[PDB]
Amino acid sequence: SKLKPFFALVRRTNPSYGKLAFALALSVVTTLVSLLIPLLTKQLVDGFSMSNLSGTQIGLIALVFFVQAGLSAYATYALNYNGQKIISGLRELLWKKLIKLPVSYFDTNASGETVSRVTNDTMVVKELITTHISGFITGIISVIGSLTILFIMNWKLTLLVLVVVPLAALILVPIGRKMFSISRETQDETARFTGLLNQILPEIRLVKASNAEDVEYGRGKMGISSLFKLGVREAKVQSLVGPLISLVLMAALVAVIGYGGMQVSSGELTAGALVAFILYLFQIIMPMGQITTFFTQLQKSIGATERMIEILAEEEEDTVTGKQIENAHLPIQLDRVSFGYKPDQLILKEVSAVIEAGKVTAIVGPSGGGKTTLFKLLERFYSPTAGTIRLGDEPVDTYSLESWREHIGYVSQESPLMSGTIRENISYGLERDVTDAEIEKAAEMAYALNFIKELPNQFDTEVGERGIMLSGGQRQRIAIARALLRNPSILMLDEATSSLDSQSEKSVQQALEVLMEGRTTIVIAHRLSTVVDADQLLFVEKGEITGRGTHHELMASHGLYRDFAEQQLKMNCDLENKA
Amino acid sequence: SKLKPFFALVRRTNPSYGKLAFALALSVVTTLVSLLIPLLTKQLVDGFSMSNLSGTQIGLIALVFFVQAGLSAYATYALNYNGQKIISGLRELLWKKLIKLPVSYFDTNASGETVSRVTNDTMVVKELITTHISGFITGIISVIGSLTILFIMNWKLTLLVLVVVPLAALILVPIGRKMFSISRETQDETARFTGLLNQILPEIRLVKASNAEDVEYGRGKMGISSLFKLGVREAKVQSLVGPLISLVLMAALVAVIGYGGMQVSSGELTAGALVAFILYLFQIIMPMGQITTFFTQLQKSIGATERMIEILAEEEEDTVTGKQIENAHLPIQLDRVSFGYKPDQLILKEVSAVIEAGKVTAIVGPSGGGKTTLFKLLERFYSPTAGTIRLGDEPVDTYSLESWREHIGYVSQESPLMSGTIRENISYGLERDVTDAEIEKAAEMAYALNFIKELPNQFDTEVGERGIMLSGGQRQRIAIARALLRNPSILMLDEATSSLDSQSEKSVQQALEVLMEGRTTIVIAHRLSTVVDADQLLFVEKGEITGRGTHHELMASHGLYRDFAEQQLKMNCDLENKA
Structure with a gap:
């Protein structure tokens, strides 16, 4: 149900399905090859009676290791490289949409929130595509594969793990949920107290004048004291939670490995079968960690794919149908x-x-x-x-x-400038040709040329956030020159x-008249x-x-x-x- | 050298040394008890020949587990409880200092930075006291203790671990440093691109007016493309780093556990001695993780103890020596x-x-x-x-x-109000007694009473950030009443x-005259x-x-x-x- 919009979204980028399928197949093959390794170690260890040490058996383990690593490197590159193609395609679609959404859209929605979406949702989707789906499948194959191999060599010791692992988790989980709840409450009270301190400090001017020294000390002391009371409540929890987690883990390990040893020591099992058992236990616990992460990621992913699709389905501005204006000043x-x-x-x-x-x-x-x-x-x-x-x-x-x-032409006070060159700003967006001999024939008019010629460079300054700061009058004069280069019929x-300085304002008024002459x-x-x-x-x-x-x-x-x-x-x- | 200022600082809070020493002793005893557990499992497993299963041996393991957990709960509570006392004492000292630092100190230093210090440095010090010192000592005792016990039962298999563990780390460390450097560079380029997008979006007003649609699309597309190029460079690193970490770890594990099995299988070792060996390996790797963390913490700790001592050594305002003024309006x-x-x-x-x-x-x-x-x-x-x-x-x-x-009396425009009651603000900091019948005899004067009586409560509103917002004229009238309750000789x-609204300003001017009459x-x-x-x-x-x-x-x-x-x-x- 929920996977039909994600898939559609991924199809919007015309991805290569063969390459993703082959990478997933390689991951599955890499996991199946990783299930040979403990059988080959068992065969080596069981074969060490009278210490023959066949060199071909320790060499074959190395060949299987280099083969697993070679296929895992290839699958990992392919998955990451295609995810990087998919996410790039998504961002290009989202950006081409945003630039065409009507100016109404940014009036209702926050620009920063839109940027945050196009920069995070795509990321989440990437993370899901490159890592989490393959991680989840490989983990399931590793977990079910390892358990099936264990049950076929010794079913008593896996029956024990299939009681020890769920009963250990049935304890650690609730105790961990309870622990984290106390950590959140102490974070919040820390935050409340810092907030309270912050709020007192900039008003120290009055505190001093009013003789409120003991008064503001005492209100701060009550914050120290509430933090201390929650800190003691956290200490009484952490003191039971810490010992109990260590008690459980070591009791689980001792029970599993001691029953492994008590089978080998009685003759019910071999030394090499115990070795294989331990080697597979690591191939159960870690991908089980992996699979669990898949679901949270999946939830977040759905929400992202909901927002992005929302943007990429919205209405865009029909900028290019209708007539062409003749004699526009009417x-x-x-x-x-x-x-x-x-x-x-x-x-x-x-x-x-x-x-x-x-x-x-x-x-x-x-x-x-x-x-x-x-x-x-x-x-x-x-x-x-x-x-x-x-x-x-x-x-x-x-x-x-x-x-x-x-x-139309357009100018405002309180304007910034487009990050780019000063010649690029004085001719911004106009697709007609321009030349050095005419771009300054528009700039001498707002008194922009004879200001710009005094800067370290006469055509650039990296204007805006990178370069030097400009005053409102200089920014207005740069805007007034752009409109003279367009020569609009209506202005x-x-x-x-808000508020503004009157500095140089009469020279700015004489700069402004230039543009508005003889046009509406x-x-x-x-x-x-x-x-x-x-x-x-x-x-x-x-x-x-x-x-x-x-x-x-x-x-x-x-x-x-x-x-x-x-x-x-x-x-x-x-x-x-x-x- | 560096530990003499920390210690002195800790002594400033008159801590209980006996209780910290006893808690540390209990932690050391808890670690030594944790070295019995694998010997008792070896004795149980070695004793399972002909499957006698002496109930006293599996019961004694449970008694040792409950004893380890009981002492670990006590030590963990004591350490946390004393750390919570020490940190509370530190914060009380730092706050009593800050409130008395001359108003010059907050003119040069940022209030927020001071709050940040008193809320974070104390925390760092706490974390060091409660967890990191005990963690470091116990880890060293656990690591050196476990290795010494291993070498006394089988020196060949620990000699192998003392080559496998350092040679695995000598690979993983540089490969991990290199990996993280690429993750930082892609974070920075992600940040640069979001910044660039942010900067374009609020200026959409001009972009639209100027026909800069393809221009702003193309500058965004170059950001998509630089991110994609760094993403492919990260893919070519992650594809070698991932397989190589897994190759190393599994080759180390196979080498150690396979040589364990190949000793038990030849008769050079027992099934229970292999069990003890695995159980101790977990008591080597994890506290080794712990100890490593101690040093970074120690560095941060030093810096904190440097800032706090800096504050608590600074000069404070000598508010309380000199004469008493008589006839002050002169x-x-x-x-x-x-x-x-x-x-x-x-x-x-x-x-x-x-x-x-x-x-x-x-x-x-x-x-x-x-x-x-x-x-x-x-x-x-x-x-x-x-x-x-x-x-x-x-x-x-x-x-x-x-x-x-x-x-003196004091009043300003642009003032906030102290978080507290309205009667508490109208009488702030003055240690003379006040009464309902006179606190409003100061408030009818600024027209404050007949404004305050129209609010949901006639003596409170949780004024400031918690309660309802007040206009500048209302805040000024509340300040003017406080000064009439002090009856200062000089004002x-x-x-x-900055800038202000003229709304109700003539009524505020008539409120202001009240206070300044017949005083300097x-x-x-x-x-x-x-x-x-x-x-x-x-x-x-x-x-x-x-x-x-x-x-x-x-x-x-x-x-x-x-x-x-x-x-x-x-x-x-x-x-x-x-x-």
Whole structure:
């Protein structure tokens, strides 16, 4: 039942079944060859009466050892090499999917969790394929094979092992479960106490000022004391568990080996048959260890194969069907548009606007008021809940998302840069050709060239986490040059959120104007004073919009709706409004 | 050499040496009793000729097993119980030290690192005391004892083990070191690749907008490929290492047990002497495992005992010698005061001021300009580099730090609250008696009572990390009530840094005035407009101070020094200065 999705998943990578089957066959043959070794030692030891020592018998044991090792090396390489092919194919599929999942997917799901899945689930599956299946089969063949060979030479001494091994395990298991429960509880109390100490130490500033020396000592002392009480409770458990595990193991060993010796010493058995018996006991206990591990692995494996298949079945973004845009700067109408993540809550509704060729329109309104939805609707970062976005007089969902994203340009504050060269960032993702003589003809414009020429290298710095740190103004100027190299007909601007420094800001404002000249521009911001020059402002009413005039008209005949943001500004200052 | 600081450290806890010595003696006796068991099994097995089976011989083995387990339970409890006493004593010493280390210590050293030390070093030392020393001694006695008993019954078969065991180890060790090196390199490349994927995923916003789909796919594909290449290099190592470990172990076992059988089968040995030989081999291999672990533990232990002793030898704050203050609101002079963390850089120098009875003085100046040093000097959070702080006409270092911290009061923005009750916070650390009828007579003042009475409980909420989250204004009002319950003669105020919300701020300003009335107040802040009412402002010049007048005098005859902060404000707004 559960093995049909795993198999299907493995088949997605078009694996070579012959090579895996042959490797498994070699493992099975390696285990069967490992059951000859104790019979050949018994034949050698039984044949040592009057000390003949036939050299062919000790040489044949070496030939069988080198043959077992040669086949085990081949099977182990083949299994690992194909597992490495299978896992590589899985990761390539998962990565090609992730890069095409709609930007909605990363809005709902954590990027780190997705990375964690593609890096761990594939690993689990690998581990299952390369080691655990072959380990499990070989262990079963080794265990049942060894017991069958033992019962055919001396059934009394294996009947004893088939009582001693289960009765020893029936004791050690519960005693071990009980032990581990106490280890977890002391770990948790250790954690609680470290947490408590951590929490007191950064507030030492007040503790000192308030004369709370004995008070904070005493609350820490109660933690020392609760840890000590659990430590004594662990001591009273570990003192019974330790001696009892050693008592059981040695009583099992003495019982098995002493009855082996008491058969050889009476004549009911030979010296070489006892030798074979010990040599097989090691071939019972260890693979029995192996097989047990298979099942936990199998559970984890199922969960992984559930998550990966989940990703690789999800919807991907249809970026490449529709028309091609001609004369793209034409009027963007919204007419009866609407949105919500689910129809339970319509985040934006009954909206209409026009956005005008070569002008600016500014989305500015209350913090947390949903205003970011209209911006994400206009850049196609989100599909409307059945209401029209229209360019000129054609519904915008007509044009291909490639032919849309090509005639849009995009810039933000708070941006990092792509790990790569500075010329690679100044021309990122655009498949048109570029040249040294024009890539800096886009960079002199944002004042990027005459900044970049002062760095240790004029085309690289390993920008981002590897290279030197850059200030927000430098990062913005690098973004503004990329958009001048695309020469988009429409521009989407994310001017600021959170908080920022005003250092060099007037030179950054003079850098920004370059890009927005003579093309249609849509801006989103957190304050009115940054937006005083705009040809239409849009105020946001937690689901609906008004304003639809100059900044001054908001200051003249809007009133209370300016006051619902301007009061929070006037708690700090008049923000250069001077009114 | 290295054992003299550990021992001294252990002696600091006044441990019971008799009980540890007796537990170690019991462990040694338990190991010697564990060397009888295989001789008694040999006597039983050798005595089984003609199958007499004397019941006293199989009963005596059980009596020796229950005696070994009884003494092992007692020794194991005693060792763990005394280790739990020793570690508890260590932690109590370390915590009583930390709480008294000067506030300078936590300024240089990370609190988390100190917690980590007191929670891990003590543990390491515990582990060494309870398990590793006894484990090491018992292993040596078990190993040398078992080998000495083997050589006295059959020296040929132990001479073989004393060649087989070292020659097997001389192979497995290097092959294992080499194996682990490849496992580390693949871990690192896995980490590098996850890091790379992580770094791409939160920037999916641009990747989509820029048409960088094949570009970001290909950079990820190169990571899949480098991981696959290292995976194949690991496969070519694991394929030789696995077979070779199994080949060696089985060749060692076959050689030892086959020569055991070939002695019994020729008559050079008995069936029971072979049984004893196997039973002792297990008493050689496992404690040899144990002893090896002792040394790594010993190294770690030394490092721990080095850090803990370091803490427990450090200087602690002399909080309780000097005079007692009378009439504490008198003039605080600074005259030729100076400071620095080291004399290499004098952070503040040649400073003089007066701070005046029942007035306000405000420390306001450039960000990162060192101004926080003068505030920390005035509250005695730091000693001057030989220049006088003086109250009335007495040097302030005359009064006890208790009798100082009692006549000071202290409040800050950005503060958390002590984990505890709300009545416990409103009266924190003060050793004077309090009553329900007066603790709320301090709380009605900050408007704290009529806020607290609306919570689910009127005296508790488990405030901080356990309970409900509180806003900055509520936390400030709780702090302001504590200072009214102390009724300090002098007040130290940290008004704001970083960033804050203006929500309810005018009601918080009306709450703050309550505390500062009719007592001397020192304030530190980040903007001039918050401080317009102050009777003296102090501007800071990266080592020296001026201003020494009203806010308006800074606005009238200071000029360029107001401009060196006011310009950065005027990039945003005039900040209600209206000039």
